[PDB]
Design a protein around this ligand. Structure first.
Ligand SMILES: *[C@@H]1O[C@H](CO)[C@@H](O[C@@H]2O[C@H](CO)[C@@H](O[C@@H]3O[C@H](CO[C@H]4O[C@H](CO[C@H]5O[C@H](CO)[C@@H](O)[C@H](O)[C@@H]5O)[C@@H](O)[C@H](O)[C@@H]4O)[C@@H](O)[C@H](O[C@H]4O[C@H](CO)[C@@H](O)[C@H](O)[C@@H]4O)[C@@H]3O)[C@H](O)[C@H]2NC(C)=O)[C@H](O)[C@H]1NC(C)=O
Ligand SMILES: *[C@@H]1O[C@H](CO)[C@@H](O[C@@H]2O[C@H](CO)[C@@H](O[C@@H]3O[C@H](CO[C@H]4O[C@H](CO)[C@@H](O)[C@H](O)[C@@H]4O)[C@@H](O)[C@H](O)[C@@H]3O)[C@H](O)[C@H]2NC(C)=O)[C@H](O)[C@H]1NC(C)=O
Ligand SMILES: *[C@@H]1O[C@H](CO)[C@@H](O[C@@H]2O[C@H](CO)[C@@H](O)[C@H](O)[C@H]2NC(C)=O)[C@H](O)[C@H]1NC(C)=O
Ligand SMILES: *[C@@H]1O[C@H](CO)[C@@H](O[C@@H]2O[C@H](CO)[C@@H](O)[C@H](O)[C@H]2NC(C)=O)[C@H](O)[C@H]1NC(C)=O
Ligand SMILES: *[C@@H]1O[C@H](CO)[C@@H](O[C@@H]2O[C@H](CO)[C@@H](O)[C@H](O)[C@H]2NC(C)=O)[C@H](O)[C@H]1NC(C)=O
Ligand SMILES: *[C@@H]1O[C@H](CO)[C@@H](O[C@@H]2O[C@H](CO)[C@@H](O)[C@H](O)[C@H]2NC(C)=O)[C@H](O)[C@H]1NC(C)=O
Ligand SMILES: *[C@@H]1O[C@H](CO)[C@@H](O[C@@H]2O[C@H](CO)[C@@H](O)[C@H](O)[C@H]2NC(C)=O)[C@H](O)[C@H]1NC(C)=O
Ligand SMILES: *[C@@H]1O[C@H](CO)[C@@H](O[C@@H]2O[C@H](CO)[C@@H](O)[C@H](O)[C@H]2NC(C)=O)[C@H](O)[C@H]1NC(C)=O
Ligand SMILES: *[C@@H]1O[C@H](CO)[C@@H](O[C@@H]2O[C@H](CO)[C@@H](O)[C@H](O)[C@H]2NC(C)=O)[C@H](O)[C@H]1NC(C)=O
Ligand SMILES: *[C@@H]1O[C@H](CO)[C@@H](O[C@@H]2O[C@H](CO)[C@@H](O)[C@H](O)[C@H]2NC(C)=O)[C@H](O)[C@H]1NC(C)=O
Ligand SMILES: *[C@@H]1O[C@H](CO)[C@@H](O[C@@H]2O[C@H](CO)[C@@H](O)[C@H](O)[C@H]2NC(C)=O)[C@H](O)[C@H]1NC(C)=O
Ligand SMILES: *[C@@H]1O[C@H](CO)[C@@H](O)[C@H](O)[C@H]1NC(C)=O
Ligand SMILES: *[C@@H]1O[C@H](CO)[C@@H](O)[C@H](O)[C@H]1NC(C)=O
Ligand SMILES: *[C@@H]1O[C@H](CO)[C@@H](O)[C@H](O)[C@H]1NC(C)=O
Ligand SMILES: *[C@@H]1O[C@H](CO)[C@@H](O)[C@H](O)[C@H]1NC(C)=O
Ligand SMILES: *[C@@H]1O[C@H](CO)[C@@H](O)[C@H](O)[C@H]1NC(C)=O
Ligand SMILES: *[C@@H]1O[C@H](CO)[C@@H](O)[C@H](O)[C@H]1NC(C)=O
Ligand SMILES: *[C@@H]1O[C@H](CO)[C@@H](O)[C@H](O)[C@H]1NC(C)=O
Ligand SMILES: *[C@@H]1O[C@H](CO)[C@@H](O)[C@H](O)[C@H]1NC(C)=O
Ligand SMILES: *[C@@H]1O[C@H](CO)[C@@H](O)[C@H](O)[C@H]1NC(C)=O
Ligand SMILES: *[C@@H]1O[C@H](CO)[C@@H](O)[C@H](O)[C@H]1NC(C)=O
Ligand SMILES: *[C@@H]1O[C@H](CO)[C@@H](O)[C@H](O)[C@H]1NC(C)=O
Ligand SMILES: *[C@@H]1O[C@H](CO)[C@@H](O)[C@H](O)[C@H]1NC(C)=O
Ligand SMILES: *[C@@H]1O[C@H](CO)[C@@H](O)[C@H](O)[C@H]1NC(C)=O
Ligand SMILES: *[C@@H]1O[C@H](CO)[C@@H](O)[C@H](O)[C@H]1NC(C)=O
Ligand SMILES: *[C@@H]1O[C@H](CO)[C@@H](O)[C@H](O)[C@H]1NC(C)=O
Ligand SMILES: *[C@@H]1O[C@H](CO)[C@@H](O)[C@H](O)[C@H]1NC(C)=O
Ligand SMILES: *[C@@H]1O[C@H](CO)[C@@H](O)[C@H](O)[C@H]1NC(C)=O
Ligand SMILES: *[C@@H]1O[C@H](CO)[C@@H](O)[C@H](O)[C@H]1NC(C)=O
Ligand SMILES: *[C@@H]1O[C@H](CO)[C@@H](O)[C@H](O)[C@H]1NC(C)=O
Lengths: 472, 136, 136, 136, 53
């Protein structure tokens, strides 16, 4: 039948991959609180009350992992928000002063209700003072303050210190009005673009997904920050699964995703008051005023049975990825304090948790059940004030002290690993998984493993048996 | 009975009955609303990221309108031109096409001929009414 | 003759002879001029707001065109299709409407089912073309 | 076969069969690409001129559509309505215009009677369509 | 400095074209200043008063 003629169509269901800018869309129930969150500022559009989801039945799409352009867009978003939220705050240039520093002598209740008995802040902070000018000729006073040892170093001239970052670059003090609380964000594409969401449970990095359903735009995402252990994440529905760009290639990181969360709950037991001093015209500067009452290291608690069972499950999952090799865990082998230490933010101040008793273990053959008691795990977690969250792209930021006892509780869902390239142990077989590492992006690819950006192409062509009726 | 992109996996024959539902959502979207509350509100990155979203919405949609304008099929979901298929682009019989050849992979098969079909259709429209302008 | 919005209060029938003047003024305006004289005039506060005006101008015209594009009579001022009334969106007769009720008040009465009117109208245009494809 | 704008100096009659070449390049250019490779590239002075470039492309193309929309010749290349031409704008005969005078000169020759004519077309379309409603 | 100068151009060496100027500006800590010397061309340097300054 040569009599066929072309017949264009409109709104045809055909798409193709592409890259497109995305706009924020925050929830109405959590916004308008006037806190002016750093991450999800007031500029986000109101989210749709009823996000939809249209199931697609006879569809196969070649998804990908570690190649999403969405992660770069949201990385740029977070960098820009962190930069802009700090510009209207005060600098700390007049803090490059030769601090005269001595130890601390604190008297309080000796028992201090020490349940953990981990230790005390003594011989870890350096009670420092520096001169301030005065009208009289050659007469100076002391403006005392308390600073942690991680923010002072000594160069020469024994009994004299200075800020660690006051010389390398410029540091600002974040205004207390802005809050670091991560508000959920919904990324939503402009009209004319669809977001594909794989609802398959046991979906690793890449590979076709035959259960994908198309939504207008993504669900909530948490912009939370961490280094060694993922926090506040979304549990994998199916089962504990392992993800990587290439398992045999040790260079790439390995991300553990759980299905049952483990609750982490720990606090600073110290007692502090925010003393204010005036430097420059109308630019107040805060400092750790005094400590009275409770003096104890910032412990951290993890339930022992849950953690050991989770490790047993994860090693069981890893076993089928390495046939005859025993799995062992070792503490981080070094690096800066951002890797060898757990890092997470808590209501405007940044912890640094040791996390070694969790990650020191071994699993030879799982032959028998190595029974144990109920136990409580304690992690001595240090605290830093001057923080440069990122290597050379983030602004040095000075977190102000927070008054009173501060407590944070969160869900642990993700674990970051890394392999070691043994050569001559062809029979003396074992595997070490040093935790930590990974860029800031890997903290975020754990949530963007379901979404692919496509572009609708609603113009289609196919032959029919119709011919246009020419008019006369 | 099908939502957005509902029948994108279905066969050729039954997919056509949901062309409208995938056509009403080419411009409407969340971008219609202004913001949660109207610093640099107009100069924040989302003050310009949102603006970049709006300009892509009209440009991407209106590009398709350009091709519909030339071919004479303006204001028609389904059109009917007069370009005879010469069987060179694809010689599958009509039964083999509309029975179980799904949409998403259909025009990828013809993907080497889009650059010429989008040109030969324009000529066909031009030649139709040049005869008409000297006939009335 | 009447100018812009020159018969917004006049009756239904007598306001059907002034449609052409308002259609013309839907994009024409003084915003076409870039600036009186072009530091950083691109990002000047008087410049960022002007750019917002131009984007809102086209999106407001495109919104109307898209709906009228789908209804099968793109490129006409007045237009009637083949969707009969169910006579429950407005149970009023003819002369009671076109003589003494006004445009502004009329919209409020029917503004309660438009989302069920625009959708049903589009389906009719699609339905007509489907019968045409299998006709010749 | 000609190139883009390749016959502007030719006679009008022999330049009436190459309009599709010009009409095919009103939006399809180079601006559609975002950037060569992605610190907030959206605010660089080089990157702030695409916004002026992109919105100028549509805002210049829409003006063409608006006039084509009202006249009833929307969705066509060479249309022709039924409004008389009383020769007061140009009284030259059929042959004296088409075959010898070029396009650019002709556009300049009546550039001062355009605004009257552009209003005549829309009114001719509107009152003609009023007959249709007053016909059935 | 060297005296051979590879005198093929034989136009002139750069004496009097630069000035050894040792100024005195503060270090990172604003309360301390140190003496640092630098070499500047004469086109970048002017004298207000008090020659030898
Ligand atoms: C906050 O403010 C306080 C006070 O303002 C700061 O403390 C001051 O620091 C400065 C340093 O910046 C000190 O100056 C030093 O004074 C020394 C004293 O020398 C004098 O005496 C000499 C002879 O006296 C001898 O006997 C006495 C005891 O009887 C000894 O102490 C002395 O060393 C001698 O053995 C005289 O000949 C001399 O002229 C002085 O009058 C100085 O010797 C010393 O000089 C050092 O540095 C010189 C370069 O600047 C160098 O040339 C010298 O060789 C030498 O190395 C220096 O000027 C103040 O004394 C001290 N005030 C006190 C202690 O009350 C404090 O540093 C500041 N905090 C900061 C900046 O963080
Ligand atoms: C992971 O998810 C967890 C649960 O969603 C997060 O825990 C919650 O985190 C938020 C964010 O900071 C906390 O909200 C704060 O709550 C305090 C409570 O103030 C109390 O005291 C004042 C003064 O007496 C009183 O007025 C209040 O009513 C309270 O009694 C507020 O003061 C803060 O402004 C802020 O709103 C939640 O408290 C906290 N949950 C619990 C149970 O503590 C967790 O933060 C997430 N992970 C990370 C890393 O953020
Ligand atoms: C800022 O000061 C710190 C310490 O006061 C410097 O870090 C040390 O620099 C010396 C060289 O002056 C090195 O020998 C040390 O190894 C450095 N410390 C460490 C832990 O590596 C830092 O270099 C200074 N930076 C600037 C820009 O002045
Ligand atoms: C999380 O995933 C693990 C898979 O590693 C699930 O472990 C399975 O648990 C069921 C019942 O507890 C056993 O019958 C299976 O044998 C386990 N899997 C393997 C490989 O042995 C675990 O159940 C999941 N968590 C939840 C809450 O379902
Ligand atoms: C998080 O941990 C803190 C401290 O371990 C818990 O606070 C204690 O709760 C017990 C139980 O009633 C009290 O007896 C203690 O007095 C509390 N501590 C203090 C300093 O008052 C807290 O309940 C834990 N929260 C969660 C959700 O686990
Ligand atoms: C740092 O050390 C100084 C000096 O020891 C402390 O100053 C003391 O402040 C208390 C507060 O009432 C006074 O009772 C003492 O008399 C002060 N000491 C002297 C020698 O007068 C300062 O409090 C310390 N800073 C801290 C602990 O944060
Ligand atoms: C740590 O482990 C579990 C939480 O899963 C708690 O022990 C459970 O206690 C309930 C009854 O209280 C029993 O039915 C479970 O069989 C127990 N499971 C295990 C693994 O022991 C225990 O209380 C937790 N401790 C804390 C401090 O949270
Ligand atoms: C995290 O905790 C572990 C457990 O104690 C620390 O390991 C010891 O660290 C001290 C000094 O930091 C050394 O003297 C010991 O030799 C280490 N091993 C043991 C078995 O005690 C580890 O150092 C802590 N992390 C950091 C960064 O100090
Ligand atoms: C995906 O393909 C299957 C093929 O079996 C479709 O199932 C058939 O669908 C047709 C038309 O809907 C029916 O006439 C058959 O009876 C169905 N057979 C079976 C075994 O299901 C299925 O409908 C396709 N997916 C979609 C969304 O249409
Ligand atoms: C430029 O204009 C002159 C003016 O006529 C054109 O000359 C004619 O060209 C056609 C082309 O085939 C010939 O058939 C005629 O014989 C030529 N002369 C006349 C008097 O018509 C010339 O072709 C034009 N050039 C272009 C490129 O259009
Ligand atoms: C840098 O330090 C030198 C050494 O002190 C300064 O030279 C003398 O400074 C004193 C302090 O005012 C003056 O009274 C002397 O007159 C200076 N010497 C001479 C020869 O003039 C020098 O002035 C300092 N740098 C600057 C820019 O003042
Ligand atoms: C401060 O404490 C350290 C470590 O305990 C000790 O070496 C030093 O001598 C102490 N100095 C003073 C002045 O107490
Ligand atoms: C602090 O801890 C040290 C060692 O753990 C102990 O000797 C001391 O008594 C504690 N208390 C004070 C006030 O230093
Ligand atoms: C993901 O899983 C599929 C099937 O289990 C497998 O073929 C593929 O290699 C996996 N991807 C990676 C990166 O391991
Ligand atoms: C497919 O996706 C849907 C989405 O809700 C899910 O409920 C279902 O379990 C998935 N698998 C199958 C076989 O339908
Ligand atoms: C803790 O700090 C607060 C700060 O105002 C103070 O009121 C309180 O007395 C301190 N001690 C305790 C046990 O709360
Ligand atoms: C299991 O984990 C807990 C964590 O507290 C630890 O105390 C215990 O020794 C572990 N048992 C074995 C056999 O590894
Ligand atoms: C371990 O080695 C044995 C030796 O033959 C082999 O049969 C087996 O497949 C290997 N892997 C596992 C998981 O046992
Ligand atoms: C901790 O790690 C060391 C590494 O040498 C290992 O020998 C030891 O068994 C682990 N566990 C404990 C409780 O020390
Ligand atoms: C741990 O288990 C042993 C087993 O007999 C028991 O004797 C001991 O008291 C237990 N310790 C705790 C703290 O439960
Ligand atoms: C944390 O995990 C528990 C389950 O153990 C869950 O009920 C709770 O909602 C989670 N919290 C958040 C903030 O997701
Ligand atoms: C059919 O048309 C295409 C247009 O791209 C052309 O390439 C091909 O040669 C034509 N075939 C025949 C048989 O005319
Ligand atoms: C029809 O198409 C098939 C595959 O494209 C090809 O093998 C066959 O030769 C074609 N038949 C004709 C007559 O062109
Ligand atoms: C009137 O319109 C409604 C939808 O708004 C429809 O459900 C109803 O069937 C219509 N009336 C009749 C008589 O069909
Ligand atoms: C038309 O409406 C007006 C009031 O708006 C009323 O006075 C007049 O009676 C109405 N005409 C009829 C025929 O009801
Ligand atoms: C056109 O009008 C001009 C002056 O209005 C006159 O000179 C000329 O002869 C006219 N030509 C024709 C063909 O009517
Ligand atoms: C053609 O136009 C030119 C001027 O453009 C004129 O000189 C010539 O007479 C005209 N010829 C005819 C036949 O109109
Ligand atoms: C149009 O305006 C110009 C401007 O002065 C004038 O010279 C001309 O005569 C007018 N008419 C025409 C046909 O150009
Ligand atoms: C011819 O049309 C023009 C429209 O521009 C009008 O001004 C003029 O009056 C008309 N002439 C006659 C005789 O109607
Ligand atoms: C080089 O410079 C010196 C001054 O340093 C000067 O005396 C001499 O004349 C210059 N020329 C030669 C050729 O040495």
């Amino acid at each position: 039948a040569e009599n066929l003629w072309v017949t264009v169509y409109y709104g045809v269901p055909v798409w193709k991959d592409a890259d497109t800018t995305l706009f924020c869309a925050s929830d109405a129930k959590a916004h308008e609180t006037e806190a002016h969150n750093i991450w999800a500022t007031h500029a986000c559009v109101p989210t749709d009350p009823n996000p939809q989801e249209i199931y697609m039945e006879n569809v196969t799409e070649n998804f990908n992992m570690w190649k999403n352009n969405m992660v770069e867009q949201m990385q740029e978003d977070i960098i820009s928000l962190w930069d802009q939220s700090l510009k209207p705050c005060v600098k700390l240039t007049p803090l490059c002063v030769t601090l005269s520093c001595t130890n601390v002598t604190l008297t309080n209740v000796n028992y201090t209700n020490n349940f953990p008995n981990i230790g005390n802040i003594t011989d870890e902070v350096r009670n420092c003072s520096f001169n301030v000018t005065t009208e009289i000729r050659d007469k100076k006073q002391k403006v005392y303050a308390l600073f942690y040892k991680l923010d002072i170093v000594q160069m020469e001239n024994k009994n004299s210190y200075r800020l660690i970052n006051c010389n390398t670059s410029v540091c600002k003090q974040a205004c207390p009005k802005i809050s670091f609380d991560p508000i959920p964000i919904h990324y939503c594409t402009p009209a004319g673009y669809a977001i594909l969401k794989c609802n398959e449970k046991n979906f690793n990095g890449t590979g076709p997904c035959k259960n994908v359903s198309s939504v207008q735009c993504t669900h909530g995402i948490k912009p939370v920050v961490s280094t060694q252990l993922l926090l506040n994440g979304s549990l994998a529905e199916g089962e504990i699964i392992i993800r990587s760009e290439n398992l045999t290639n040790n260079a790439k990181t390995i991300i553990v995703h759980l299905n049952k969360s483990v609750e982490i709950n720990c606090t600073r037991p110290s007692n502090n008051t925010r003393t204010s001093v005036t430097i420059g015209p109308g630019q107040v500067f805060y400092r750790t005023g005094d400590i009275i009452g409770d003096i104890r290291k910032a412990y951290c608690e993890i339930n022992g049975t849950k953690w050991n069972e989770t490790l047993k499950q994860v090693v069981g999952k890893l076993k089928e990825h390495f046939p005859n090799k025993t799995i062992s865990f070792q503490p981080p082998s070094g690096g800066d304090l951002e890797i060898t230490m757990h890092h997470f933010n808590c209501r405007g101040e940044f912890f640094y948790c040791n996390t070694t008793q969790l990650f020191n273990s071994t699993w030879i053959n799982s032959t028998t059940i190595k029974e144990y008691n109920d136990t409580i795990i304690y992690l001595p977690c240090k605290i830093k004030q001057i923080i440069n969250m990122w290597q050379g792209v983030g602004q040095c930021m000075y977190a102000p002290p927070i008054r009173g006892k501060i407590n944070c509780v969160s869900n642990i869902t993700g674990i970051l690993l890394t392999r070691d390239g043994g050569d001559a142990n062809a029979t003396n077989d074992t595997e070490t998984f040093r935790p930590g590492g990974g860029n800031i992006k890997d903290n975020w690819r754990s949530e963007l493993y379901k979404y692919k950006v496509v572009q609708i192409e609603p113009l289609g062509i196919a032959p029919t048996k119709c011919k246009r009726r020419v008019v006369e | 009975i099908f939502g957005f992109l509902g029948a994108a996996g279905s066969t050729m024959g039954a997919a056509s009955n949901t062309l409208t539902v995938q056509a009403r959502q080419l411009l409407s979207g969340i971008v219609q609303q202004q913001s949660n509350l109207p610093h640099l509100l107009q100069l924040t990155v989302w003050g310009i990221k949102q603006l970049q979203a709006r300009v892509l919405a009209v440009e991407r949609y209106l590009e398709v309108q350009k091709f519909l304008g030339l071919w004479g099929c303006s204001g028609k979901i389904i059109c009917c031109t007069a370009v005879p298929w010469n069987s060179t682009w694809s010689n599958k019989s009509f039964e083999q096409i509309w029975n179980n050849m799904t949409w998403i992979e259909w025009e990828r098969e013809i993907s080497n001929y889009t650059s010429q079909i989008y040109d030969i259709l324009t000529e066909s429209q031009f030649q139709q009414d040049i005869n008409e302008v000297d006939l009335l």
